[PDB]
Design a protein around this motif. Sequence first.
Motif, PDB file in Angstrom:
ATOM      1  N   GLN A 181      15.443   8.095   0.183  1.00  0.00           N
ATOM      2  CA  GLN A 181      15.270   8.674   1.511  1.00  0.00           C
ATOM      3  C   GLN A 181      16.214   8.036   2.524  1.00  0.00           C
ATOM      4  O   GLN A 181      16.569   8.653   3.528  1.00  0.00           O
TER       5      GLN A 181
ATOM      6  N   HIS B  51      13.780  13.499  -5.075  1.00  0.00           N
ATOM      7  CA  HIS B  51      15.054  13.128  -4.469  1.00  0.00           C
ATOM      8  C   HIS B  51      16.155  12.983  -5.515  1.00  0.00           C
ATOM      9  O   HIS B  51      17.274  13.451  -5.313  1.00  0.00           O
TER      10      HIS B  51
ATOM     11  N   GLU C 106      17.286  15.967  -5.572  1.00  0.00           N
ATOM     12  CA  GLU C 106      17.431  16.509  -4.225  1.00  0.00           C
ATOM     13  C   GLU C 106      18.917  16.450  -3.878  1.00  0.00           C
ATOM     14  O   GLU C 106      19.414  17.232  -3.064  1.00  0.00           O
TER      15      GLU C 106
END
Lengths: 68, 68, 68, 68
Positions: free
Chosen positions: B63, D62, D65
């Motif tokens: 992230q 992710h 992602e």
Amino acid sequence: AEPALREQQLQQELLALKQKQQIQRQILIAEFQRQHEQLSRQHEAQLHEHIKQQQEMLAMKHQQELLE
Amino acid sequence: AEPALREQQLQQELLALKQKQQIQRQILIAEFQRQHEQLSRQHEAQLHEHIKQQQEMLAMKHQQELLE
Amino acid sequence: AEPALREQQLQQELLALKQKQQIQRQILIAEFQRQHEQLSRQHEAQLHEHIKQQQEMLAMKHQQELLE
Amino acid sequence: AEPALREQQLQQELLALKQKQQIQRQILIAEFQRQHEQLSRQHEAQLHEHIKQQQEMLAMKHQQELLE
């Protein structure tokens, strides 16, 4: 390094958690074995105490009957 | 009466003993259940605590890596 | 949705895990209470079985002593 | 001898009973420790299994992602 480090820190932390919990279970079980053996011996003493009185009772019922 | 009285006194004293001990066992088990359920939930809140951090770990790993 | 769906699925699967584990502990304590009360009463039936013989013992010691 | 003998027999029979019961208490606690450690590890294995899967979940979230 960094995420690789936090990745390594959690792994170890987790492995340390398992080790900790397995011992606390041993303590919880040890705590109980003690309380359990404790009440078990008391109960026993009351039951034996019964023997050491169910004695004098049936004793004096005749131990003096020879004089009654 | 008298010896028949002490005879009857012990018989009742005994039956009263059984009734008593059987409840002390229930208190002993109830005591432990509580101790047991107590550690069981702690152990769990640590393992979950792990979840909520093994989260922010892999979280800021990507992230944030997205911004890297 | 999809990952958000897997997020929700894991959360639910977690809360469901807790509920299941807490009952298994109860089944475990229940299993033990039973074995415990069970052995507890046997011990007792041997201690009483003793009383019902520590009786006849001192009985024929005097109960017939009137003839000895 | 005889009544004196039956007296000695019961005193011994009694002392023997105590020793026996104390070990059965230990076998009883041992039986439970095992059932308890056993269920404690399973519980754990399901909590870790949740870790080794809450992993992939947030992984593909992710880890791919970057291509989604």
